[PDB]
Amino acid sequence: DEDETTALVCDNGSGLVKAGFAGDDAPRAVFPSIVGRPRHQGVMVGMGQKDSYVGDEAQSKRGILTLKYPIEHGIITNWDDMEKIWHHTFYNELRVAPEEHPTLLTEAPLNPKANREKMTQIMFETFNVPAMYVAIQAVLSLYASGRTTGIVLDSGDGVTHNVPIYEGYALPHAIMRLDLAGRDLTDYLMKILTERGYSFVTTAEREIVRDIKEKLCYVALDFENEMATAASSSSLEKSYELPDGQVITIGNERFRCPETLFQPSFIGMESAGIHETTYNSIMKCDIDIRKDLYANNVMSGGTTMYPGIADRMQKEITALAPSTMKIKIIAPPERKYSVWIGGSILASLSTFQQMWITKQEYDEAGPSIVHRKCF
Template sequence: MDAELWFHLFMRTCWPPSGALLAFAEGTTTPVGIDWRARLQARSAASPTIVVDVGRGYTKYTVADGIQGRWELDGCSPQLVQLCSSPTHPPDCERNDQLRYIQYMLNREFLQAALSPSHRLHKAALAPQNRLKQGGYAVYRDEHDNAKPVKVQKCDEASGQWSVEVLQSSERGILSVPSESLEPIRMAQDLPILIGEPFVITAAGTGEKAAWEQNIRSQLGNDRPGAVQVVSQAQMALWAHGVDHGIVVNIGQGQTVALPVVKGEVLSQCALSSSIGSGDLTQVMVSLMSRRHPAIVDSSLMTWCRDLKENYCYVSPPGRGCMRSRLAAGDDYGIRPVEVELPEYASARTEENTLELAEERVLVPEVLFESNRGLGLPGLIVRCADAVLASGKSSEEGVRELLRQVVLVGGAADFPGIRPRVEYEMRSLLQSSQFERLLGCLSSAEDVFVLNPPLGETGPLVTPRFVPLFGGCVRAASSKGYGAWERDSNIGALRSLPLLADMPEGRSNSRQVFWQQRMRRMLALQLPDIFRTGGGGGEDDQAWQMLDEDSEEGSESSNLHFEEQESESQAYSPSSPVDWPSAIEEATASPNERVSSSRGSGRSKGKGKGKGGGKGRVRRGRLIWRPVQGQVE
């Protein structure tokens, strides 16, 4: 049964480690009649793809391969480009230079990867032999099999020898070498690139879109060898859940935007936005902490307050009335205070080196649900679905599917408890008289779901902050790949792939029936149900659990932290996007001397800055609610 063996090999070899997402990426709903060998070969032979999620404060990027997956491995943060500025963290580059900067950083990384077979980008960094050309770069292996970076100058057609310049400072000089001893180094410009169009641009008019696209073209150039594909980040977020139909809500730096996607087409005319964003939540944390500690906390500690928000805040269970009023009346919501360390530059303001964080842990995320600040998060989603229904752009069945497939993305979507709280309040809103027609599309108000980030075999594959980037990688890793620059209205819809094998004639025997059923189970095609809470394929965010403090005194609300790595910023000059000579020393230096790691030089926003080491103080002898991560059965 060669077909069965190739199917199992494909499933165990290819990325992502999710049968449902692999099936989605391959555009199939059945494993039968597909030439899995051809698809495996297509993935193996395809060039990796650069995937970019353009943001306002930070832009995320990575390199995705159909076999190896993401460059940084699942569960690790992608490469970050800091665009926002703070007194302690200057930006990496200008906003209008970010794509040039990304290609510049990747070219430096490719040089290191080409010289190191153990580097995860080693395969991506080496181009086919026919790409050897004058002015390019290559790896030269001498008679002792020592690898050296060289710049290719010209070829002597009579002898077939190439003149190359050795770039290592200790061995600089011109050599004449045969072509078979040279391995061309690929440039970032040679790879296809998938760019996520920001939510605010997608929701804006055609004028802003045209200006944004023109800026992209000016950064990449019209003569870029690698194909360029632009797609909405809303579609990318849905791809991470194996669907192309749903409502995606991005809690961005400056605002929150809800975008409906109907069968692969973004309905920008039905988009809704709120002026509340992650930056506002940070400002609220600064305000609350400065009110409690006026002599210590001020705007200079904004970055520290941002880290407190990301590391210690969670969304409280739903309650009646205003949370601030209830807290003032003595209802503490079972909040566990924690001691957090002050940064070194602020410790001189007080004899203590720690501060207490208590009700701020729930008051900051509560801003997303307060109606007095405009549309709360649940109302934004419900009104977005109502706008789609009123526009006539989707049938009642399509609107029902929109409400079943809601995805939250952005940094604030990492708050524990946010998805079930949004789900709960959406169901409550749908029972009000103003949404009577919308409720009529559903079997009941309970027929509303906010999808969880996908799980792999060893844990969550990604956090909500990086879901659009991950979704772009899922599609970029497909055996179909991407074509040239195009912007058709249905770019997100799945296309049939030309790798179908002939179906066997006649009746299938029992052996064929058995393995066909087995393959269907492996593909787990019950999308998107598996990404609902309790579905088994997503991070099962049970949100809140009632605990007895006497038995859980030392426990603390757990929030998933992905491995992130701080790296020193690199000097960058937009006028010189490929500074190879300065990168040579890093690539050829000993491990102790290298400036950058094998993961690249993109700056990662640090987690845990200012995180306190002490346990939170608790009030004993009563039951409390706190967010926990549920176990997937």
């Protein structure tokens, strides 16, 4: 609180907002992106509740609330709800006066121009920021990495991409999309557990299943052989206590759930699994740069956090590639916050501080400015 200034790095996630100050090593505020007020709301004797805050309160308030994601699939679809999320971010989580900070916002891949313009309009008109930037989330991640060359497999919450990069450039024609990512894997685990006679269907039960997924699932060494071991499997049958206190047993569901990344037909997806899309992406590049891609396969995103994933990807890529090809899979430790960190590096870039968009630019060429000939 003086001269200088930082850069409000707000990564608008499909399920979680990550926000903080440029220059910090990780976001200081992480809260669910949802909207929820009592679904039954039966009055009582007073009030003192906040209608649709969701954020952190919701979670801990599981069972009372309803949820909505105004950013459900990564694109913002409800501007009144999004204004509530940004107000919460600035005033309740970070506890800042937004008019004192240049703010860098992230946007999903393929975000419409008109959507970026509405984001810009809200920042300047509603929150009175002195400036702002919009950054592409994949791009920020790439930034955080620091690798000019290599092929990234980025699997997050709602989408997975394979992005080959040569000298810093995402050759746009190589990238392929997959709908599936963590949101789909949590829904599939709810369904397969419901196969055993359990019942996980409510909003609260979804949260419970997301926790089982993140704590007990793993990727097999070989799907077929893991299924065969399931028979005499005395390991798989882990126990998990529900908040009600009942204890369920989870066995082959531990590896059947994430097997979907390699076999999208488990959820009905025709798409090619992540090892096939990696190969298909490398084959859309020049033959010449393929050796550099094969030796620099970088994993990113929350859904690449499973133990065993790098070894499995090494095995599968080795099976598809030429016999003399050197293959290397890199996974950065704390991948998931790779998107926020790239934003932090960019926003905290004094040297490129002219890329921030300003109140004068917005007034001159409206918000589009932050879209036409920059970010």
